[PDB]
A paper describes a structure:
Parvoviruses are linear single-stranded DNA (ssDNA) viruses with T = 1 icosahedral symmetry capsids, affecting both vertebrate and invertebrate hosts. To expand the architectural repertoire for the parvoviruses, two aveparvoviruses affecting red-crowned cranes (RCPV) or turkeys (TuPV) were selected for structural determination via cryo-EM representing two species of the genus with ~55% amino acid sequence identity comparing the VP2. The VP monomer for both aveparvoviruses retained the basic capsid architecture with the conserved eight-stranded jelly roll motif (βB–βI), which is extended by the additional βA-strand and one alpha helix (αA). Like other parvovirus capsids, the surface loops are dominated by the large GH loop, located primarily at the threefold region; the DE loop, which forms the fivefold channel pore; and the BC and EF loops, found at the two-/fivefold wall.
RCPV was first identified and characterized as part of a 2018 viral metagenomics study from the fecal virome of wild and domestic red-crowned crane populations in China. Following cryo-EM data collection, three-dimensional reconstructions of both aveparvoviruses, utilizing 405,850 RCPV and 35,131 TuPV extracted individual particles, were determined at resolutions of 2.66 Å and 2.35 Å, respectively. The short threefold protrusions of the RCPV and TuPV capsids are primarily formed by VR-IV and VR-VIII. For example, VR-IV was significantly shorter for RCPV than all other genera in Parvovirinae. These differences contribute to the truncated appearance of the threefold protrusions and fivefold pores of RCPV. With the technological advancements in recent years, cryo-EM is capable of generating high-resolution maps of macromolecules that allow us to discern fine structural details, such as water molecules or bound metal ions. Both RCPV and TuPV maps had conserved additionally ordered densities in the threefold region of the capsid, which represented potential metal-bivalent cation-binding sites (most likely Mg2+ or Ca2+) with ordered water molecules. The bivalent cation at the side of the threefold protrusion is coordinated by identical amino acids in RCPV and TuPV, including D262, T263, D272, and A273 (RCPV numbering) of VR-IV and Q355 of VR-VII. RCPV is most structurally similar to QAAV, with a structural similarity of 65%, a Dependoparvovirus which affects bob-white quails. RCPV showed robust binding to the Pro5 cells but not to the sialic acid-deficient cell line Lec2, displaying a similar binding pattern to SAAV.
Author numbering:
A (entry chain G), B (entry chain A), C (entry chain E), D (entry chain F): 27 to 531
Write the structure that this text describes.
Amino acid sequence: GGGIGESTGNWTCNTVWGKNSIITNASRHCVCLTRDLDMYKAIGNKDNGLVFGTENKTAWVGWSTPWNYIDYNQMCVHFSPRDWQRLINTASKWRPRSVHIKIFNIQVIQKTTVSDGTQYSNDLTGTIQIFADAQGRYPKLLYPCQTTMMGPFPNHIYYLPQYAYTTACDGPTSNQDINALLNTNSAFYCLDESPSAMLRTGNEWSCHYTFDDDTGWVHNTRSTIPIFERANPLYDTWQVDLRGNDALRGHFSSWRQPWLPGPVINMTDGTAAGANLNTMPGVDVGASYMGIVPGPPICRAENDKDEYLQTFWTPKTIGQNEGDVKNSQINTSTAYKSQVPTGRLWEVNARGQYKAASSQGNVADQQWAGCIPGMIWDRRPATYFDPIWQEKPITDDSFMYVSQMGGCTVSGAPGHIFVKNTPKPTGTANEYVDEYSTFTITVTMEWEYEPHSFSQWNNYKMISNNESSAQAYVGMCNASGQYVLNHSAGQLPEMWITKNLSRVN
Amino acid sequence: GGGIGESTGNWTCNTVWGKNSIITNASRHCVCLTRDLDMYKAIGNKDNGLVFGTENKTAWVGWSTPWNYIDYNQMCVHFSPRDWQRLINTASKWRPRSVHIKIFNIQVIQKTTVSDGTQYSNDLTGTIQIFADAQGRYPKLLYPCQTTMMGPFPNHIYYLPQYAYTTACDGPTSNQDINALLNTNSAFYCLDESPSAMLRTGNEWSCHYTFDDDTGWVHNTRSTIPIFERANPLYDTWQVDLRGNDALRGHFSSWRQPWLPGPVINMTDGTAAGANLNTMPGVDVGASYMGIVPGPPICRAENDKDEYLQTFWTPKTIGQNEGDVKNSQINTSTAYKSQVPTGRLWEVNARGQYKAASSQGNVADQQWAGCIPGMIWDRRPATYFDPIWQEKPITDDSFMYVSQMGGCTVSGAPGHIFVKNTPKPTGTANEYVDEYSTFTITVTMEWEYEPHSFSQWNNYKMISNNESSAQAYVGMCNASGQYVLNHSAGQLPEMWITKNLSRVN
Amino acid sequence: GGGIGESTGNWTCNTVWGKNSIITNASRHCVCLTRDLDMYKAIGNKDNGLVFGTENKTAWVGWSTPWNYIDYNQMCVHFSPRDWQRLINTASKWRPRSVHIKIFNIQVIQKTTVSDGTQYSNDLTGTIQIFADAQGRYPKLLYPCQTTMMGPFPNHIYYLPQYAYTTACDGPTSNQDINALLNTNSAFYCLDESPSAMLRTGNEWSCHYTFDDDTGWVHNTRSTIPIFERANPLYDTWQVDLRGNDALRGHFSSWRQPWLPGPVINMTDGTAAGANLNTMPGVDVGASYMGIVPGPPICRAENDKDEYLQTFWTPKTIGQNEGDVKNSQINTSTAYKSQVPTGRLWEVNARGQYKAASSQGNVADQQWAGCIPGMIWDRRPATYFDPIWQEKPITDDSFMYVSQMGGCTVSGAPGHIFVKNTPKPTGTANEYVDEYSTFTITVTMEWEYEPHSFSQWNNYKMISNNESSAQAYVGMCNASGQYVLNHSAGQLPEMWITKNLSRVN
Amino acid sequence: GGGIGESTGNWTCNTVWGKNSIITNASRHCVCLTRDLDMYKAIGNKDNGLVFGTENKTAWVGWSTPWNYIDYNQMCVHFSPRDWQRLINTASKWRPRSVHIKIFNIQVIQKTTVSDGTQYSNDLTGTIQIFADAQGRYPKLLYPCQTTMMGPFPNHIYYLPQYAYTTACDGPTSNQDINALLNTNSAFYCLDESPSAMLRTGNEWSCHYTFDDDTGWVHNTRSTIPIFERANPLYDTWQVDLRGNDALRGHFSSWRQPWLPGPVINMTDGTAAGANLNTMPGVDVGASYMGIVPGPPICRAENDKDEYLQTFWTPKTIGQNEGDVKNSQINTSTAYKSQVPTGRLWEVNARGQYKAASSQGNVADQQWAGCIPGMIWDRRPATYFDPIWQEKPITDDSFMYVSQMGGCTVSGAPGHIFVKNTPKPTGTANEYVDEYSTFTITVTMEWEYEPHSFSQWNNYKMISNNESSAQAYVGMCNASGQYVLNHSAGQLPEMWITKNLSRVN
Ligand SMILES: [Mg+2]
Ligand SMILES: [Mg+2]
Ligand SMILES: [Mg+2]
Ligand SMILES: [Mg+2]
């Protein structure tokens, strides 16, 4: 009952499967580090070069808070390779339902510097402060899959990332610092003001978040039938062809259709070193450019096209106890460049940019083909590494919001849970007792999935492991103890991709 | 109780503020004028020149009815400069809830012509007819902000505008009158058939209209965070850049995004005198061209661009008792040309037209960028002069309807209230007792607004008056008794613009 | 019951006396005139000369509203010469308790211009708007005794004065109009917005106002005993004299006192034509000077000193039906200059400015002697022409507020009652049916007075009429029908002055 | 339940706003330092030079106690820049209602000296003693805004200031120590005698203080109307001018007034280095001079006058964890000299010292103009940095007590809360285990404010942030983590000043 000697919680990483629900528990050992001597620091990049290949080319401004926060949003955190596979094979679609988070077994550790080395001792009376931003008072970090994430493997040690945000930024002018970027719209947030539980070793903390019924689904189903061949093949139609003429038997493409595939925006890949951002498809927003790559999903037969396919880095191996990743770029040699192939969009999605009449009875490739009524398409295939949910920035209006990168749409998402070491001052100016805290977090997510059944007589496709992945230690720990997960660059292995199960219609 | 000696209503122009609701009362003294000797008159413009700079260049046909109608739809009518400011500072968003309208203290005045001048006497037994088109039997005039509007200032005398409408119009052919424009689709409406209360001096009239819960909101919130910088700045992401490469720290523009800004249609401004309408962006509809200017809102740093920003005239001063405005063009020298700047869209809206891959690894400016899934944008900033609600013409299908001009979407709007002087004939052919009626209208609108609170630690922006506006008599009556309201041409003063309050996310 | 044929109220001007209460009814026939074509007009004086003898030498800015208001605040309105005398003789002190106001028998009269002359006809359906500013929403005109007042005599016809106010004024700069005077603090008030009863001939209007128990008293008592001789004359005192020495018998002035008289500010009178305002005692406030004349009351034997005694104009005669007085200066030859003698302060108030030690055992005249603890004084004698109550401008702090001019202090005063003719438009721009309204107002004020009894054996002083006043038609109507009231310039007749009755201690 | 492992309280810094009440929570991490080896020490300054520019020029004597105390009295501690702004815009006036104080999460830390450096370890059984002086047994430190204050920013670490006081002091004589200053009136207070809770890590401490209904208000309202122009501008008055003559239209300054502005004491600024204190306006008290600067508030157009305007230092930046400030003068280069402009007193307060009749019909400037009856004035504008309440020293009599420096009057204020580390002796003479304690304090203050509404039709003034303040990190933490708050010397930014909202009358 709060004594330093009884444990405040238990470690559970097991997944329980219901008929249409999954409960996944992610328990991690988390290291909370004092951030910037417990100081909010104004941070920004004045330079607004907007050129590819160079860091700090986008002007931005904001504050790094002393607080650390929990980022569990990704699929690989909550699903083992085994459970993900079951999910891929078993469910047409799934969505998160609730997330329960426990923080317990809190240890504030004092680091003491001695000649031999650092000495670690428990600070029994030391507290950590924890508050959950249910209200959305503080800026949400909505960008998916940063290094802020928990490890996929239970045994990985999690260092809560330092909470920082960007605020309203002016277009930079010459010979001026970051403050110049700040304006009357710019917002400084002091997390410290918010009521936050102060926790000692005896204490436990939990919050609960429930997703609204309007939460988006992640779809594992692929169409069996081509959308352009929906006809009975044995019968002619009264309908004319595209050109206006008789619709010949077995020439469904020529025939007019009651529907069309989703919108296609022409996309390009640029290899020019230090090219201007506006070289790539996108648009200027504020003082900085925003790109639309990859854009609306289109089926691409080709294995390696950056613009068309979802592309992201995956760790080659994942070390069990990596240091705090604040301000550290992922090493290129430590990551695979993985592209998610859209060949699973073969039945529904358009392969290439649309041709429409340009002039004089000619059709031109459509650089931007927006949504027109009667358009039907499938989403980009989701992946294991994709966020669970994607929260779009609040705006007046959005159109059929889907993240190309991944995640399922949510009217609202779990608010950030902020954890910070309570500063223990030494009684001397600018000096604090050097302390970090370790605790165990348990993220328990309830899931909903729709079971998928096959009505086709013939054998159907299941996703199975392969020898090359096993011999790559995929979903295993290698000889060095590192957790491999994705084993290869290029086309992301079929295991981690959704849109597998076969829907009839 | 109906006697000519007791008043049938009271004058209230006060605004009452609830926690989340506002009740605004607009009381005006209205002059009802006999229209065209109580005759429905076929009116049309045969010429369909479709060229800028010349009146009657659009072919149209319809009828001017003897009836007059109430047009209270605009914000400046129902909100004083003081109340509008409170609304701008206090509320994130607002919408109309109900509108109650009273017509009372009716005076039918006989005008008698004598050598000295016109003599005015009360016609005690004279009636006015009033009916409200709740059913939508008669054509709705949906076009926002015509000279039909009530004055913003309570003391202004309101002359009900003559009700006229356009109907189905044929493309005009040479050597033919307006009748030729009429076709089998053309609709003549006789208001007189509808049951209408006949009212004497003793009588009072009221209707009530309640907006559906589906009514659109007018949004006063501005995003603090750039939508392209939503990431934690201190952390790298697993995500690749736009080009497919490593996403550098502090170069958010290069990074791929889980969302994109709203659609951008390239817009142009033409200064060519008497230029063809098709010169401007738009499309042909029926026999006449329809333009899409300003189009989807985009952030424009520049103060004066007609196509990009909402542009409308505001009165320089507003006289207290202007004559009936039927068939009178607003004098150019009596109006300011006001453009609503979109610089408040800096965080969310795209600054310029999108670039998408054209060919050979090149990106071209997109003349039309339609909505594609995952697009998020903010509406054009609303203004004090904007209509309260905008009712779109009935059609089978509409897409995310928003008026660039202004107003909030309504599944239905208050039906027109038609008021006409009952004709008093002299017993001689084509001769009527010359009479107008004055009455007091009270438009009581219940409003809903969402209170806005700031969670940012630092000081936030409020909209305040400035010396230049005060010294322009803004929201005041000048030395001549005229009510100034908007004091300057060009960029419309920040007071009258919405999207002020700061939303966190 | 609201018909044009039954009267809506009765005329009562009688005063009813209770044991300690007086009810006074002031009924007047009021003419309500259309003001400035029903237009709020910005009005100001840019010139800030601040020199005596010239009009518009004080910079000010504000608006004249279309509204007219009721000003009944003065004693001569509510008390006949007979009742005032009874009050002066009977009561030590009095204060207003409640005020009830009826407006009834409303006639809207249309003025028609014909060759013979103006023709007057009743506009039966015409309304007047009346609202009482209980809330204090609109600026209070607190300045006592303007030409806005009702006549003292019941038969006088009252024209409601046009409501105008001054607002925050900037210090004027060269080559600029009144608008320049306006600033961000300046306040424009639209009376029209406020809910106001619209009244026809049948209608009656009433409000009630109750004074708080904290309302100030007007004091009719004079001290019999000199405050400096409070001792038993037959006995020596242990107390030393002022100089520190033995206090001789019958030399009370030499003796030290347990109290001192009220504060004395040296005052001067300047006869210099066009002298700077700062010549007179006072202080600069805002961009304009404010004078402190007459200042704290001091007893002055002399009959004619402007600075020391309350000085104001009284009408020589008062015509029964004077025209509207808006913007008309009182004619000098039509007024008596009346000074209220302070010789009644003989027992208590200090005759002249205090001497205090300057240096080297010398005493100098004190130009400003402020309040010091132990100071006791009597107020300046109140008069018949003095306001009933004086409302000071709202401020954070006030010190023992008393108006030298007159009136009794009130935490709050009856809010202005605004009456305006509802504009009747002709249907033509800037043209209204020419109309004024006449109605009968009844101001019923309940008073509280403390009965005064004499305990002195010998005969006491009563205030009686004199032959010279009777032969001046004082409190009478003269041969021409004019109501004389004050009959002489100089020392105001003893009849109209308070501080008569003799208090023992 | 008291174990070292469960936390004894939570951190809340949030502000909750009621309709007319505000609850502000100030939570700080406090460092309690052993003071002077737990010894009461007689402290005094024998020198009584009474000359400007040199420290210890005022003779004083007293004791520094081993105890530390809580000083939370200032506005910036309890209101974030955001909440202060809301308060400034929203409320006419406000006052503190209750203050609740929690002290919890107490850590006694032993400091151990080792060759490497100081080693910090928790002393589990160590106590701190806390007692609140509700009774007023010990001297109150009433002087506003010393370095004893908590930080305005939640994350700032608070070091409780050592409690010391001054007692009755004799005028010093040559060749004598501080003891000579002590006399029979001098009072030594031993805090140790008072019952005080001894607290270990498990323990929590709280007190509650409720302000009496007689507590003073801080006023945010400014008069719109000049007090010298309170008249209806369109009407002449019966009242004479200041000089005794006809009161001209639009020359309100010339007119006599029913009230006068508050008292003005002539004030001067002296630049003479090492000038005698008596050079400045003030008076001798005891053996030391007391100055009256700034004195009664007067409106000053000029931006920089020390005597007339409230003047105080504000930190340029505020470091998060400054060392104990006992006996440390604020560095001049670390502070802004801020003067609070009185230009907001334009409507009510007198601009300059009063002129009153000197002699021979001449008026002289009044060096001291004390309160005379009928004087009305506004207080000096309050500021964000001003104390919450100001407690005057107990005396027999006070007159309309207001602190020019700031704060609201209180019949009584929260008694000092004294916290001291329980001395842990080593068993050796004059040797104690070196220990300090850190704890978290929460100051929860309930506030009352009167909501302010505008009745003026035109736009009104709100206080908004400006770009220069944002680009100064006002209300933000700068790049170095320091909390800027006031960003400029000279005129204190309009954000932090009260008397904003516009009262009608
Ligand atoms: Mg066929
Ligand atoms: Mg990177
Ligand atoms: Mg004697
Ligand atoms: Mg005059």
